[PDB]
Design an enzyme around this catalytic site. Structure first.
Site, PDB file in Angstrom:
ATOM      1  N   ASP A  80       0.729  -1.184  -0.144  1.00  9.71           N
ATOM      2  CA  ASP A  80      -0.181   0.179  -0.016  1.00  9.71           C
ATOM      3  C   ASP A  80       1.098   1.403   0.106  1.00  9.71           C
ATOM      4  OD1 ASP A  80      -2.517   1.344  -0.391  1.00  9.71           O
ATOM      5  OD2 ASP A  80      -2.993   1.165   1.984  1.00  9.71           O
ATOM      6  N   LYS A 117       1.674   4.426  -1.071  1.00  9.34           N
ATOM      7  CA  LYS A 117       1.214   5.631  -1.700  1.00  9.34           C
ATOM      8  C   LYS A 117       1.315   7.101  -0.808  1.00  9.34           C
ATOM      9  CE  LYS A 117      -3.209   4.574   0.817  1.00  9.34           C
ATOM     10  NZ  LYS A 117      -4.745   4.335   0.343  1.00  9.34           N
ATOM     11  N   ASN A 134       0.616   7.518   2.896  1.00  8.44           N
ATOM     12  CA  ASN A 134       1.538   6.714   3.888  1.00  8.44           C
ATOM     13  C   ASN A 134       2.877   7.087   3.791  1.00  8.44           C
ATOM     14  OD1 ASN A 134      -0.764   5.213   4.622  1.00  8.44           O
ATOM     15  ND2 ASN A 134      -0.419   3.721   2.952  1.00  8.44           N
ATOM     16  N   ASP A 167       1.525   2.935   7.847  1.00  8.87           N
ATOM     17  CA  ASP A 167       0.484   2.260   7.601  1.00  8.87           C
ATOM     18  C   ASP A 167       0.748   0.709   7.015  1.00  8.87           C
ATOM     19  OD1 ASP A 167      -1.976   1.106   7.406  1.00  8.87           O
ATOM     20  OD2 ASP A 167      -2.981   2.673   6.289  1.00  8.87           O
ATOM     21  N   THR A 199      -4.439   0.264  -3.392  1.00  8.52           N
ATOM     22  CA  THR A 199      -5.313   1.386  -3.714  1.00  8.52           C
ATOM     23  C   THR A 199      -5.217   1.341  -5.117  1.00  8.52           C
ATOM     24  OG1 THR A 199      -4.508   2.514  -1.668  1.00  8.52           O
ATOM     25  CG2 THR A 199      -5.223   3.882  -3.692  1.00  8.52           C
TER      26      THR A 199
HETATM   27  N1  LIG Z   1       3.704   7.974  14.341  1.00  6.48           N
HETATM   28  C1  LIG Z   1       2.891   8.749  13.872  1.00  6.48           C
HETATM   29  N2  LIG Z   1       2.930  10.099  14.375  1.00  6.48           N
HETATM   30  C2  LIG Z   1       1.999  10.956  13.870  1.00  6.48           C
HETATM   31  N3  LIG Z   1       1.091  10.806  13.277  1.00  6.48           N
HETATM   32  C3  LIG Z   1       0.873   9.552  12.919  1.00  6.48           C
HETATM   33  C4  LIG Z   1       1.496   8.645  13.207  1.00  6.48           C
HETATM   34  N4  LIG Z   1       1.011   7.152  12.809  1.00  6.48           N
HETATM   35  C5  LIG Z   1      -0.036   7.663  12.163  1.00  6.48           C
HETATM   36  N5  LIG Z   1      -0.247   9.279  12.232  1.00  6.48           N
HETATM   37  C6  LIG Z   1      -1.261   9.983  11.605  1.00  6.48           C
HETATM   38  O1  LIG Z   1      -2.576   8.937  11.509  1.00  6.48           O
HETATM   39  C7  LIG Z   1      -2.993   8.702  10.305  1.00  6.48           C
HETATM   40  C8  LIG Z   1      -3.485   7.427  10.131  1.00  6.48           C
HETATM   41  O2  LIG Z   1      -2.504   6.467  10.357  1.00  6.48           O
HETATM   42  P1  LIG Z   1      -2.442   4.997   9.826  1.00  6.48           P
HETATM   43  O3  LIG Z   1      -1.321   4.117  10.335  1.00  6.48           O
HETATM   44  O4  LIG Z   1      -2.337   5.250   8.058  1.00  6.48           O
HETATM   45  O5  LIG Z   1      -3.764   4.631   9.661  1.00  6.48           O
HETATM   46  P2  LIG Z   1      -4.919   3.326   9.250  1.00  6.48           P
HETATM   47  O6  LIG Z   1      -6.072   3.260  10.075  1.00  6.48           O
HETATM   48  O7  LIG Z   1      -3.968   2.247   8.994  1.00  6.48           O
HETATM   49  N6  LIG Z   1      -5.478   4.314   7.693  1.00  6.48           N
HETATM   50  P3  LIG Z   1      -6.228   3.358   6.593  1.00  6.48           P
HETATM   51  O8  LIG Z   1      -5.857   2.025   6.740  1.00  6.48           O
HETATM   52  O9  LIG Z   1      -5.712   3.963   5.320  1.00  6.48           O
HETATM   53  O10 LIG Z   1      -7.796   3.623   6.598  1.00  6.48           O
HETATM   54  C9  LIG Z   1      -1.758   8.994   9.441  1.00  6.48           C
HETATM   55  O11 LIG Z   1      -1.867   9.191   8.339  1.00  6.48           O
HETATM   56  C10 LIG Z   1      -1.062  10.334  10.235  1.00  6.48           C
HETATM   57  O12 LIG Z   1      -1.721  11.467  10.108  1.00  6.48           O
HETATM   58 MG   LIG Z   2      -4.255   1.116   7.307  1.00  3.39          MG
END
Ligand SMILES: Nc1ncnc2c1ncn2[C@@H]1O[C@H](COP(=O)(O)OP(=O)(O)NP(=O)(O)O)[C@@H](O)[C@H]1O
Ligand SMILES: [Mg+2]
Lengths: 68, 303
Positions: free
Chosen positions: B131, B133, B136, B152, B172
């Site tokens: 994934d 993109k 991420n 992610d 995606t």
């Molecule tokens: N270590 C981190 N520090 C700061 N912000 C973070 C961090 N990890 C994640 N985020 C924020 O949280 C968002 C979501 O994290 P993510 O791990 O991509 O969640 P997700 O539930 O897997 N999203 P998705 O699967 O695409 O529906 C990121 O795009 C950042 O804005």
């Molecule tokens: Mg995710």
């Protein structure tokens, strides 16, 4: 990915696709968005009557803050 | 009855949200140290969703690299799972490129080098991200020159050496590889196809494959039907186009690998090979790219 959508981001995104105009046009929505998503805003955006309005001007700001 | 996160960490504001997670800033109270808590409410997850959550937690624990989000702690409570990461504060890479206004091939090369180092590390650990993109790709901080951080691992899978398998249709749409769209067995090369898509966008600010008809989009991806049109590509070095061609190779067995890409002259000899010219049209397009992305998700969220 981050799924957070705020009103300021939506308005600013529309404003970007409107090339920084305070309104957006139907043909700009059709060029820039999927045909389905282009028809959605066209149907739900009120007419823009603020400064610099032209025929067809759509109020993406009113549309956006109605939701977000 | 063990509640270690509730006992020891204080939650603050939301940093981001996923489909089934929220990420909130937290502080380990005794230490005063801030982290990002990725919180999954487990009360209503299916058995398969539990397995995917457990998989992400295992993979995140495994990956320690300067260009990958770093897991600090992992805590299971009654109805919640917490993945506690070191906090990255620079936001999304693509938002930063626009905000800092100026961007050249040399900048893109430095950026893709870090993404490739992260991908290589994943692959050396038997992980395929699946994934890759823009959403991420985060930045470590708001400092100029902050490291890119791959985030992610929710779709990531574990592979065994170089064996290919049908691991399922995941990813995606604009970044999906031909082999995934053909339902062929796949592996590490899917990440290099996505890197080619990302690199293309870093150079001109719009995607190589784009169609409102998703069936047609997938036809274009499977056909490898991208182009380097004038005028914007006229000023892109042949070496940058060559690296894109090698990533966007339909045959995954002939596609460049992460290790090979890191040795490509536009990466390894960036200072003498990559152009230093600012590409205003690229930044202007990227601003519209980011806008279309945001509206695509926000228009569907309102529907
Ligand atoms: N270590 C981190 N520090 C700061 N912000 C973070 C961090 N990890 C994640 N985020 C924020 O949280 C968002 C979501 O994290 P993510 O791990 O991509 O969640 P997700 O539930 O897997 N999203 P998705 O699967 O695409 O529906 C990121 O795009 C950042 O804005
Ligand atoms: Mg995710």
């Amino acid at each position: 990915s981050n799924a957070t959508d705020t009103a300021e981001q939506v308005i600013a995104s529309f404003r970007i696709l409107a090339s920084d105009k305070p309104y957006i046009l139907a043909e700009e929505l059709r060029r820039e968005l999927p045909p389905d998503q282009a028809q959605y805003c066209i149907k739900r955006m009120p007419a823009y009557s603020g400064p610099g309005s032209v025929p067809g001007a759509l109020d993406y700001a009113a549309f956006s803050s109605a939701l977000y | 009855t063990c509640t270690r996160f509730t006992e020891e960490y204080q939650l603050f504001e939301e940093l981001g949200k996923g489909a089934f997670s929220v990420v909130r800033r937290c502080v380990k109270v005794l230490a005063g140290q801030e982290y990002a808590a990725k919180i999954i409410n487990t009360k209503k997850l299916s058995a398969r969703d539990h397995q995917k959550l457990e998989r992400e937690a295992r993979i995140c624990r495994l990956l320690k690299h300067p260009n990958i989000v770093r897991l600090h702690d992992s805590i299971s409570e009654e109805g919640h799972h917490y993945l506690i990461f070191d906090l990255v504060t620079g936001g999304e890479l693509f938002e930063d490129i626009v905000a800092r206004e100026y961007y050249s091939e040399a900048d893109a090369s430095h950026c893709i080098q870090q993404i490739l180092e992260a991908v290589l590390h994943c692959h050396q650990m038997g992980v395929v991200h699946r994934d890759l993109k823009p959403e991420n790709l985060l930045l470590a901080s708001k400092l100029k020159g902050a490291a890119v951080k791959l985030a992610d691992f929710g779709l990531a899978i574990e592979v065994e050496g170089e064996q290919q398998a049908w691991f399922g249709f995941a990813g995606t749409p604009g970044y999906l590889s031909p082999e995934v769209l053909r339902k062929d067995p796949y592996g590490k090369p899917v990440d290099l196809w996505a890197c080619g898509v990302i690199l293309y966008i870093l150079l001109v600010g719009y995607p190589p494959f784009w169609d409102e008809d998703q069936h047609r989009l997938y036809q274009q991806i499977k056909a490898g039907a991208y182009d380097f049109p004038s005028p914007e590509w006229d000023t892109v070095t042949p070496e940058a186009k060559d690296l894109i061609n090698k990533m966007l190779t339909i045959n995954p067995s002939k596609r460049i690998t992460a290790a090979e890409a890191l040795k490509h002259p536009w990466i390894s000899h960036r200072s003498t090979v990559a152009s230093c010219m600012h590409r205003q049209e690229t930044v202007d397009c990227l601003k519209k790219f980011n806008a279309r992305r945001k509206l695509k998700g926000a228009i569907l969220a309102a529907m």
